[PDB]
Design an enzyme around this catalytic site. Structure first.
Site, PDB file in Angstrom:
ATOM      1  N   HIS A   6       0.755  -1.262   0.000  1.00  0.00           N
ATOM      2  CA  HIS A   6       0.000   0.000   0.000  1.00  0.00           C
ATOM      3  C   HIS A   6       0.791   1.322   0.000  1.00  0.00           C
ATOM      4  O   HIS A   6       0.185   2.401  -0.020  1.00  0.00           O
ATOM      5  CB  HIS A   6      -1.163  -0.049   0.989  1.00  0.00           C
ATOM      6  N   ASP A  24      -8.436   3.124   8.357  1.00  0.00           N
ATOM      7  CA  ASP A  24      -9.708   3.150   7.602  1.00  0.00           C
ATOM      8  C   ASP A  24      -9.825   1.898   6.707  1.00  0.00           C
ATOM      9  O   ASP A  24     -10.927   1.494   6.347  1.00  0.00           O
ATOM     10  CB  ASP A  24      -9.777   4.392   6.699  1.00  0.00           C
ATOM     11  N   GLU A  49     -13.920  11.462  12.618  1.00  0.00           N
ATOM     12  CA  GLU A  49     -13.272  11.812  11.358  1.00  0.00           C
ATOM     13  C   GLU A  49     -14.064  12.954  10.691  1.00  0.00           C
ATOM     14  O   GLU A  49     -15.060  13.431  11.235  1.00  0.00           O
ATOM     15  CB  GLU A  49     -13.120  10.595  10.413  1.00  0.00           C
TER      16      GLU A  49
HETATM   17  C1  FAD Z   1      -3.475   1.981   0.173  1.00  0.00           C
HETATM   18  C2  FAD Z   1      -4.083   2.489   1.456  1.00  0.00           C
HETATM   19  C3  FAD Z   1      -3.244   2.866   2.503  1.00  0.00           C
HETATM   20  C4  FAD Z   1      -3.753   3.364   3.707  1.00  0.00           C
HETATM   21  C5  FAD Z   1      -5.150   3.482   3.861  1.00  0.00           C
HETATM   22  C6  FAD Z   1      -5.994   3.104   2.807  1.00  0.00           C
HETATM   23  C7  FAD Z   1      -5.485   2.603   1.615  1.00  0.00           C
HETATM   24  C8  FAD Z   1      -6.443   2.162   0.535  1.00  0.00           C
HETATM   25  N1  FAD Z   1      -5.725   3.954   5.029  1.00  0.00           N
HETATM   26  C9  FAD Z   1      -4.924   4.286   6.021  1.00  0.00           C
HETATM   27  C10 FAD Z   1      -5.532   4.781   7.271  1.00  0.00           C
HETATM   28  O1  FAD Z   1      -6.727   4.999   7.463  1.00  0.00           O
HETATM   29  N2  FAD Z   1      -4.616   5.056   8.269  1.00  0.00           N
HETATM   30  C11 FAD Z   1      -3.238   4.901   8.171  1.00  0.00           C
HETATM   31  O2  FAD Z   1      -2.550   5.041   9.188  1.00  0.00           O
HETATM   32  N3  FAD Z   1      -2.683   4.503   6.988  1.00  0.00           N
HETATM   33  C12 FAD Z   1      -3.483   4.200   5.971  1.00  0.00           C
HETATM   34  N4  FAD Z   1      -2.925   3.760   4.798  1.00  0.00           N
HETATM   35  C13 FAD Z   1      -1.456   3.795   4.623  1.00  0.00           C
HETATM   36  C14 FAD Z   1      -0.748   2.557   5.169  1.00  0.00           C
HETATM   37  O3  FAD Z   1      -0.804   2.510   6.597  1.00  0.00           O
HETATM   38  C15 FAD Z   1       0.712   2.489   4.711  1.00  0.00           C
HETATM   39  O4  FAD Z   1       0.737   2.411   3.287  1.00  0.00           O
HETATM   40  C16 FAD Z   1       1.596   1.382   5.295  1.00  0.00           C
HETATM   41  O5  FAD Z   1       2.832   1.307   4.584  1.00  0.00           O
HETATM   42  C17 FAD Z   1       0.941   0.017   5.373  1.00  0.00           C
HETATM   43  O6  FAD Z   1       0.804  -0.590   4.077  1.00  0.00           O
HETATM   44  P1  FAD Z   1       1.348  -2.127   3.833  1.00  0.00           P
HETATM   45  O7  FAD Z   1       0.989  -3.081   4.905  1.00  0.00           O
HETATM   46  O8  FAD Z   1       0.902  -2.369   2.411  1.00  0.00           O
HETATM   47  O9  FAD Z   1       2.935  -2.185   3.928  1.00  0.00           O
HETATM   48  P2  FAD Z   1       3.972  -1.767   2.735  1.00  0.00           P
HETATM   49  O10 FAD Z   1       3.335  -0.621   2.026  1.00  0.00           O
HETATM   50  O11 FAD Z   1       4.237  -3.051   1.951  1.00  0.00           O
HETATM   51  O12 FAD Z   1       5.366  -1.357   3.355  1.00  0.00           O
HETATM   52  C18 FAD Z   1       5.427  -0.132   4.136  1.00  0.00           C
HETATM   53  C19 FAD Z   1       6.802   0.065   4.731  1.00  0.00           C
HETATM   54  O13 FAD Z   1       6.968  -0.796   5.883  1.00  0.00           O
HETATM   55  C20 FAD Z   1       7.931  -1.800   5.611  1.00  0.00           C
HETATM   56  N5  FAD Z   1       7.434  -3.064   6.152  1.00  0.00           N
HETATM   57  C21 FAD Z   1       6.429  -3.856   5.660  1.00  0.00           C
HETATM   58  N6  FAD Z   1       6.131  -4.877   6.426  1.00  0.00           N
HETATM   59  C22 FAD Z   1       7.012  -4.761   7.490  1.00  0.00           C
HETATM   60  C23 FAD Z   1       7.262  -5.580   8.614  1.00  0.00           C
HETATM   61  N7  FAD Z   1       6.622  -6.727   8.851  1.00  0.00           N
HETATM   62  N8  FAD Z   1       8.224  -5.183   9.480  1.00  0.00           N
HETATM   63  C24 FAD Z   1       8.903  -4.057   9.220  1.00  0.00           C
HETATM   64  N9  FAD Z   1       8.780  -3.225   8.179  1.00  0.00           N
HETATM   65  C25 FAD Z   1       7.813  -3.638   7.342  1.00  0.00           C
HETATM   66  C26 FAD Z   1       8.215  -1.744   4.100  1.00  0.00           C
HETATM   67  O14 FAD Z   1       9.503  -2.209   3.713  1.00  0.00           O
HETATM   68  C27 FAD Z   1       7.975  -0.259   3.810  1.00  0.00           C
HETATM   69  O15 FAD Z   1       9.108   0.568   4.075  1.00  0.00           O
HETATM   70  O1  245 Z   2      -6.942   6.206   2.939  1.00  0.00           O
HETATM   71  C1  245 Z   2      -7.500   6.551   3.987  1.00  0.00           C
HETATM   72  N1  245 Z   2      -6.788   7.042   5.092  1.00  0.00           N
HETATM   73  C2  245 Z   2      -5.388   7.288   5.179  1.00  0.00           C
HETATM   74  C3  245 Z   2      -4.490   6.994   4.148  1.00  0.00           C
HETATM   75  C4  245 Z   2      -3.111   7.291   4.328  1.00  0.00           C
HETATM   76  C5  245 Z   2      -2.644   7.929   5.505  1.00  0.00           C
HETATM   77  C6  245 Z   2      -3.546   8.223   6.530  1.00  0.00           C
HETATM   78  C7  245 Z   2      -4.926   7.941   6.354  1.00  0.00           C
HETATM   79  N2  245 Z   2      -8.940   6.453   4.155  1.00  0.00           N
HETATM   80  C8  245 Z   2      -9.864   6.101   3.201  1.00  0.00           C
HETATM   81  C9  245 Z   2     -11.209   6.359   3.473  1.00  0.00           C
HETATM   82  C10 245 Z   2     -12.138   6.095   2.444  1.00  0.00           C
HETATM   83  N3  245 Z   2     -11.778   5.606   1.254  1.00  0.00           N
HETATM   84  C11 245 Z   2     -10.525   5.393   0.952  1.00  0.00           C
HETATM   85 CL1  245 Z   2     -10.082   4.779  -0.619  1.00  0.00          CL
HETATM   86  C12 245 Z   2      -9.523   5.632   1.899  1.00  0.00           C
END
Ligand code: FAD
Ligand code: 245
Length: 444
Positions: free
Chosen positions: A61, A122, A233
Site C-alpha cells: 500500500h 480506515d 473523522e
Molecule cells: C493503500 C491504502 C493505505 C492506507 C489506507 C488506505 C489505503 C487504501 N488507510 C490508512 C488509514 O486509514 N490510516 C493509516 O494510518 N494509513 C493508511 N494507509 C497507509 C498505510 O498505513 C501504509 O501504506 C503502510 O505502509 C501500510 O501498508 P502495507 O501493509 O501495504 O505495507 P507496505 O506498504 O508493503 O510497506 C510499508 C513500509 O513498511 C515496511 N514493512 C512492511 N512490512 C514490514 C514488517 N513486517 N516489518 C517491518 N517493516 C515492514 C516496508 O519495507 C515499507 O518501508
Molecule cells: O486512505 C485513507 N486514510 C489514510 C491513508 C493514508 C494515511 C492516513 C490515512 N482512508 C480512506 C477512506 C475512504 N476511502 C478510501 Cl479509498 C480511503
C-alpha cells in the site's frame, strides 16, 4: 525453510505499489514460512560482500516505493495464536505474524472470544508490520492513540539478522525505534496487539457544515470528551462543504441507551440542520467499509490507477489558514480531515508529529485518471503547491508516510534531537542500510 522466487508475476508485484509510480525491481522474492527464514535471509544480506537490499512487503500500500528493494530481495510477509488474557496487563492481547492483514486479525479475534483491536486504520487490507512501521490512524486514534500506542511487544529481525524480542521493559530502544520507524531497524515477525471486548454494532453518523470554524471547533470539542463518540473523522466535500463523520459503538447491554447517547451528543453540535445521515450496521461491516468501496472501484477499473497521495499532520493553531489557502485556494478526490491528541502518542517512538497538543491529519487521497499520465502530473503539481503553501506561511506541518529523499529534508522532518536518535538506532540495528532502502533515508 523459506522459498526464493524469480516468478515474473512475484517480481512484478514486488516492483510496484498502490502509488503506481515507483517501480524498482528486486532480483528475487522471498516467501518465508517463519521468523527464522526472515532471519536467515537478512543474515545472508548482512554477511554478503555487496550487502544486497532487503525489504519486507505487506499488502503493497506504499505511495512511493517504500517497500521496494532495488536489485535485492523483497520479503513477501503477507497455527495462529489464540487471544490470551493477562491479569497483570488487566486485559487481552494476541500474537500475530508481522505480515498478517488487519482484516484477518479482526476475523480471528472476533471468532475467538468476541475480542478486537481498539485502534484502526480506515482500510483493513494493510499488514500489521506495515502500519506499525508508520503509526496506523483512523477515527479511534484521538482516544486510544494510533496502532503503535496499542502494541505490547514485538519480535524483530534486525539488519544483522538477529531475532530480538522487545517491549517497553525488554530492549526498549529497539521496540520504540521500530514503532513508526519506517522499516529502518528491522522486520517485525511478531506483534502482540492490545484487545478489547468488541462492540456488536455501530451507529454511523454524517453531518454537513458550510462553516469551517464551526466544523473544526466541533471536531476539537468531540476529541476532548471522556459520554463521547467512539470514532471522529471528517472530509472535504465538493459543492466547498465539510462532513463530520462520527460513530457510537454498542452491544446488547448498551442497545437501550444508544439512541439517547447519540441525540445528547448531536444536540451539542453546530452542523447544518437537516443534514444528519444515519446508518446502523454490524461492527465488522463498518470497519470493512473501504474494502466494500474497493470492490466497486475494481469492477470499474478505477482501483489500479496512480495514487499521488499526500498526508500531513497540521498543528491545530494553523488549521484555519490551511483551509482558505488550500481547500478554497490550491484545490479550488477524497480529502480527509480530523484532529488527534498528541498525549495518546508515546514520544519515545520514531513517529514524527507536530509540536502541539492537538494536530490534524489532512489526507489528500487523490486518484489520477486511468491510463492518463498528465492527470498524475497535474495532481503531483497540486501536492507541491500544498507543500509550498505550508513552507511559505511557516506552518509547522509534518508529513505522515514521508516520501522526502534528501538528507537535509530528513534532518528537517525529524529535527535535530529525533534525527540524532534515528541515526544512532540505524548504526546499531542496520549499519549496512540493508532494510527498507526504498524509504531513501540511508545508504551503505
Ligand atoms: C493503500 C491504502 C493505505 C492506507 C489506507 C488506505 C489505503 C487504501 N488507510 C490508512 C488509514 O486509514 N490510516 C493509516 O494510518 N494509513 C493508511 N494507509 C497507509 C498505510 O498505513 C501504509 O501504506 C503502510 O505502509 C501500510 O501498508 P502495507 O501493509 O501495504 O505495507 P507496505 O506498504 O508493503 O510497506 C510499508 C513500509 O513498511 C515496511 N514493512 C512492511 N512490512 C514490514 C514488517 N513486517 N516489518 C517491518 N517493516 C515492514 C516496508 O519495507 C515499507 O518501508
Ligand atoms: O486512505 C485513507 N486514510 C489514510 C491513508 C493514508 C494515511 C492516513 C490515512 N482512508 C480512506 C477512506 C475512504 N476511502 C478510501 Cl479509498 C480511503
Amino acid at each position: 525453510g523459506g522459498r526464493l522466487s524469480v516468478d515474473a508475476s512475484d517480481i512484478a508485484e514486488a516492483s510496484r505499489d498502490f502509488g503506481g509510480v515507483a517501480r524498482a525491481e528486486p532480483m528475487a522474492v522471498f516467501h518465508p514460512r517463519a521468523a527464522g527464514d526472515v532471519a536467515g535471509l537478512v543474515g545472508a544480506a548482512f554477511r554478503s560482500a555487496r550487502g544486497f537490499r532487503v525489504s519486507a512487503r505487506g499488502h503493497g500500500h506504499s505511495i512511493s516505493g517504500q517497500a521496494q528493494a532495488a536489485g535485492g530481495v523483497v520479503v513477501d510477509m503477507s497455527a495462529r495464536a489464540l487471544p490470551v488474557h493477562s491479569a497483570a496487563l488487566g486485559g487481552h492481547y494476541v500474537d500475530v505474524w508481522g505480515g498478517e492483514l488487519w482484516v484477518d486479525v479482526l476475523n480471528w479475534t472476533l471468532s475467538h472470544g468476541g475480542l478486537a483491536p481498539r485502534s484502526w486504520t480506515d482500510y483493513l487490507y494493510l499488514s500489521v508490520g506495515g502500519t506499525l512501521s508508520n503509526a496506523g490512524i483512523s477515527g479511534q486514534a484521538f482516544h486510544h492513540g494510533p496502532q503503535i500506542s496499542n502494541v505490547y511487544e514485538l519480535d524483530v529481525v534486525t539488519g544483522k539478522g538477529e531475532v530480538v524480542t522487545c517491549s517497553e521493559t525488554e530492549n526498549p530502544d529497539l521496540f520504540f525505534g521500530v514503532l513508526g520507524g519506517l522499516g529502518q531497524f528491522g522486520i517485525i515477525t511478531r506483534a502482540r496487539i492490545a484487545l478489547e471486548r468488541a462492540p456488536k454494532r455501530v451507529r454511523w453518523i454524517r453531518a454537513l457544515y458550510s462553516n469551517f470554524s464551526e466544523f473544526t471547533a466541533d471536531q476539537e470539542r468531540l476529541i476532548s470528551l471522556g459520554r463521547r463518540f467512539d470514532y471522529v473523522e471528517g472530509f472535504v466535500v465538493a459543492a466547498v462543504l465539510y462532513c463530520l463523520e462520527v460513530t457510537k459503538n454498542y452491544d446488547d447491554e448498551t442497545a437501550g441507551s444508544v439512541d439517547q447517547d447519540v441525540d445528547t451528543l448531536l444536540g451539542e453540535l453546530n452542523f447544518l440542520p437537516g443534514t444528519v445521515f444515519t446508518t446502523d450496521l454490524p461492527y465488522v461491516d463498518f470497519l470493512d467499509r473501504v474494502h466494500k468501496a474497493e470492490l466497486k472501484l475494481r469492477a470499474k477499473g478505477m482501483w489500479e490507477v496512480p495514487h499521488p497521495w499526500l498526508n500531513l499532520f497540521v498543528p491545530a493553531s494553523r488549521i484555519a489558514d490551511f483551509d482558505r489557502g488550500v481547500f478554497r485556494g490550491v484545490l479550488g478526490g477524497p480529502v480527509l480531515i480530523y484532529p488527534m491528541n498528541k498525549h495518546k502518542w508515546d514520544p519515545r517512538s520514531s513517529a514524527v508529529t507536530p509540536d502541539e497538543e492537538v494536530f490534524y491529519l489532512v489526507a489528500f487521497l487523490r486518484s489520477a485518471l486511468p491510463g492518463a499520465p498528465e492527470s498524475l502530473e497535474a495532481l503531483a503539481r497540486q501536492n507541491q503547491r500544498i507543500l509550498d503553501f505550508c513552507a511559505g506561511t511557516g506552518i509547522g506541518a509534518k508529513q505522515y508516510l514521508p516520501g522526502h529523499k534528501a538528507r537535509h529534508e530528513w534532518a528537517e522532518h525529524f529535527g535535530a534531537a529525533r534525527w540524532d536518535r534515528f541515526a544512532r538506532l540505524k548504526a546499531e540495528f542496520d549499519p549496512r542500510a540493508i532494510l527498507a532502502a526504498g524509504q531513501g533515508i540511508f545508504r551503505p
